[PDB]
Amino acid sequence: GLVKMSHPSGDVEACMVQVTCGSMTLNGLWLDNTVWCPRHVMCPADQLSDPNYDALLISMTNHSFSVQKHIGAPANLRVVGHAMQGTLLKLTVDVANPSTPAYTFTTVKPGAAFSVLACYNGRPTGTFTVVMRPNYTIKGSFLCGSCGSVGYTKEGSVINFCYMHQMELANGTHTGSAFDGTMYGAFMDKQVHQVQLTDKYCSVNVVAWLYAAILNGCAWFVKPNRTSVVSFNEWALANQFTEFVGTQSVDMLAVKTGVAIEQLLYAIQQLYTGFQGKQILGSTMLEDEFTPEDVNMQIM
Amino acid sequence: GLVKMSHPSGDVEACMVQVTCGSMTLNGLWLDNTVWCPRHVMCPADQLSDPNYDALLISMTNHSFSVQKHIGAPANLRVVGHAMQGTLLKLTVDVANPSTPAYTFTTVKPGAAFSVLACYNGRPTGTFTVVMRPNYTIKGSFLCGSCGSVGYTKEGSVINFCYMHQMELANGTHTGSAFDGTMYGAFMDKQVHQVQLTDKYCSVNVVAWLYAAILNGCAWFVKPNRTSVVSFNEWALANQFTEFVGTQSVDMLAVKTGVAIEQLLYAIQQLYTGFQGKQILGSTMLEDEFTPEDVNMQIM
Numbered sequence: 001g002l003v004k005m006s007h008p009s010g011d012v013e014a015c016m017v018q019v020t021c022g023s024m025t026l027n028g029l030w031l032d033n034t035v036w037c038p039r040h041v042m043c044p045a046d047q048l049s050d051p052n053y054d055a056l057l058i059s060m061t062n063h064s065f066s067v068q069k070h071i072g073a074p075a076n077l078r079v080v081g082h083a084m085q086g087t088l089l090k091l092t093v094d095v096a097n098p099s100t101p102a103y104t105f106t107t108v109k110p111g112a113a114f115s116v117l118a119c120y121n122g123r124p125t126g127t128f129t130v131v132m133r134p135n136y137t138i139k140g141s142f143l144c145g146s147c148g149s150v151g152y153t154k155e156g157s158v159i160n161f162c163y164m165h166q167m168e169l170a171n172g173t174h175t176g177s178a179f180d181g182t183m184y185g186a187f188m189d190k191q192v193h194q195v196q197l198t199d200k201y202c203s204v205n206v207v208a209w210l211y212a213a214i215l216n217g218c219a220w221f222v223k224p225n226r227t228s229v230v231s232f233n234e235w236a237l238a239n240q241f242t243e244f245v246g247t248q249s250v251d252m253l254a255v256k257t258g259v260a261i262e263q264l265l266y267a268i269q270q271l272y273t274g275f276q277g278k279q280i281l282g283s284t285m286l287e288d289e290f291t292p293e294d295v296n297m298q299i300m
Numbered sequence: 301g302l303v304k305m306s307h308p309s310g311d312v313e314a315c316m317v318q319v320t321c322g323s324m325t326l327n328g329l330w331l332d333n334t335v336w337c338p339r340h341v342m343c344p345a346d347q348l349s350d351p352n353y354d355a356l357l358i359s360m361t362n363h364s365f366s367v368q369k370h371i372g373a374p375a376n377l378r379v380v381g382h383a384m385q386g387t388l389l390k391l392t393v394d395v396a397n398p399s400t401p402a403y404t405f406t407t408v409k410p411g412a413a414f415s416v417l418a419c420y421n422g423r424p425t426g427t428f429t430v431v432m433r434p435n436y437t438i439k440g441s442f443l444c445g446s447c448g449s450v451g452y453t454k455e456g457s458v459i460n461f462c463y464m465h466q467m468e469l470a471n472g473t474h475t476g477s478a479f480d481g482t483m484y485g486a487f488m489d490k491q492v493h494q495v496q497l498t499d500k501y502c503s504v505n506v507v508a509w510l511y512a513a514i515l516n517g518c519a520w521f522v523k524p525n526r527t528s529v530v531s532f533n534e535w536a537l538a539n540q541f542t543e544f545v546g547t548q549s550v551d552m553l554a555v556k557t558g559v560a561i562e563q564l565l566y567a568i569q570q571l572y573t574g575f576q577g578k579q580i581l582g583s584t585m586l587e588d589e590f591t592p593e594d595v596n597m598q599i600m
């Protein structure tokens with residue numbers, strides 16, 4: 001039985017700081033001599049309707065930004081430079097984070113999972129895992145003052161930072177930016193109403209879940225009929241599924257079950273219409289929030 | 301929305317060590333001058349079926365145990381005392397963990413949630429949240445070598461340690477010790493087949509989940525009809541639900557929504573027989589792993 005699992009957050013906790021600019025405050029991420037944070041910390045509350053972020057960064061002086069580390073030994077960090085990259089601020093501080101881990105900045109693609117450290121005013125409060133939805137939103141739990149919370153994956157000892165939380169959309173859809181500065185789904189960091197695209201099922205994750213079903217004895221849906229990847233993907237554009245892309249992780253499931261990817265792509269086409277009278281792993285809905293890598297590590 | 305939220309795990313990560321005795325190795329918890337770990341580390345795998353821990357304790361010296369800390373400040377320690385306490389070893393080491401958090405030991409009750417830091421050979425690898433099941437088991441991801449993994453809650457600055465992982469019973473079903481040394485559910489730490497009681501739905505958590513559904517505009521299941529607590533509890537004995545016991549946490553959700561507890565007790569009796577074709581908060585079955593405290597926190 002699959003469980004939602006996050007990465008241990010300790011390494012990321014040691015990098016969180018609070019960033020304050022005038023009356024606005026939120027979270028930032030302290031790596032080496034750099035503090036990253038969402039640029040809307042520069043924007044007075046009244047002016048969020050549409051801000052001129054270029055006409056905000058010029059107005060910034062040597063001491064417009066204040067940075068505080070709360071966790072570990074409390075410290076104020078003096079800001080010595082300020083630059084803007086996409087929807088993020090890049091602030092230079094005069095002390096390097098002595099607990100900077102080995103890290104990279106990669107953007108995640110829909111269907112992939114990552115861990116989120118939720119913070120409030122530089123203090124970690126909670127951690128969960130999400131998958132990037134095909135409409136480039138995430139289904140998180142973020143309350144007031146959690147902007148700048150950080151999403152990440154980990155391979156070896158290398159932290160891959162992939163998300164910095166920016167805003168809430170509909171009732172609980174959230175989005176943020178990759179650390180190159182680009183907002184996921186080209187949403188705009190303004191208090192303007194923006195429409196999200198329709199969500200879709202993550203096909204590769206549904207496939208992983210059907211492999212987890214087969215591994216737990218649940219395999220009534222497997223039949224010899226096959227749908228090819230290229231055929232499946234043309235079907236998908238019309239039926240609210242993502243394109244399928246294979247990975248070595250999927251292949252390892254197919255090798256251990258003896259069931260081919262193309263059989264499960266056929267099955268998905270049938271199960272979409274309805275499960276008829278049966279269940280799969282206790283569910284009557286398709287499940288798309290577990291990845292091949294999840295199934296591989298948890299049902300080894 | 302409703303996300304599976306865990307406590308940030310940095311405080312507990314800095315206390316995980318590897319404990320080795322003979323050919324057996326597993327995880328331990330380093331608090332001040334004490335390292336806690338499951339006592340079956342003393343038992344060679346052959347006599348795991350019927351160990352004599354009192355004899356095994358006599359046959360041991362301080363030199364029978366080695367302890368290493370792998371992550372963070374990589375210091376490794378000398379054992380200067382050893383004792384047994386229920387199903388736990390209590391080793392004394394000559395260095396006080398300088399990263400020890402403020403902490404208590406408390407035993408958790410069925411229905412309650414706590415975070416788990418899954419480790420392997422003293423390296424933290426994942427975190428997730430479980431609830432203590434009515435049959436005094438938990439469902440998580442505990443692969444080979446995760447014995448000694450630790451469960452905890454956090455209140456203010458104080459970590460409350462409540463669980464140290466001991467064994468897998470059936471597939472996916474796990475149990476362990478409180479830090480007073482007693483096994484949850486009185487199971488024996490022996491590779492012997494033992495029978496677990498039947499699991500039940502935690503009624504107070506199901507009710508909180510329906511409240512969360514109402515607060516998110518999913519209320520198709522709410523009727524004027526009511527079942528009293530006294531009468532639901534008799535029904536529960538016959539349908540494998542726990543006794544419903546209200547708390548001020550539950551009362552706040554009833555106040556906020558205007559929907560009485562007794563209306564949701566009636567709805568559970570109806571939804572138990574099947575959701576027909578309908579969904580509640582993504583789900584086609586009742587969810588009982590969200591607590592009223594958890595719902596109050598995430599949804600407010």
Ligand SMILES: *C(=O)NCCCCCC
Binds near residue numbers: 146
């Ligand atoms: C987070 O601190 N604030 C969210 C409001 C920002 C709206 C425009 C990006």
